[PDB]
Every structure is written in structure tokens, then in C-alpha cells.
């Protein structure tokens, strides 16, 4: 399967993403996920 590639690539990020989205329950979860992933880079890479 393609699990191992995406095992390495994402890992903790999607977990924190949907954990925050499920906790918040926004009106648009998908846009919230995209903005959160942007912010997640803006903390991690920088």
C-alpha cells in the first residue's frame, strides 16, 4: 500500500489538524483544515 510514504510525510500534522477541527466544530471544516496546515508550516518550517 501507499501507507509508508504518507506515514513519513504527514504523521502528527493531520492528527492535530482534525483534533482541532473536531474540537472547534467550525462551519467550514475543510477551509479550517487548509488554513491550519498553512499555519502549521508557518510555525514549524520557520
Amino acid at each position: 500500500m501507499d501507507t509508508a510514504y504518507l506515514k513519513n510525510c504527514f504523521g502528527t500534522g493531520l492528527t492535530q489538524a482534525l483534533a482541532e477541527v473536531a474540537r472547534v466544530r467550525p462551519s467550514d471544516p475543510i477551509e479550517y483544515l487548509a488554513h491550519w496546515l498553512y499555519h502549521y508550516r508557518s510555525i514549524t518550517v520557520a
Binding site: 500500500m1 501507499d2 501507507t3 504518507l6 506515514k7
Partner: peptide
């Protein structure tokens, strides 16, 4: 392909 059972 079948990630629906794999990883989610």
C-alpha cells in the same frame, strides 16, 4: 488506491 481501509 484503497487508502479508505489503509490509513484513515
Amino acid at each position: 488506491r484503497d487508502i479508505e481501509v489503509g490509513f484513515l
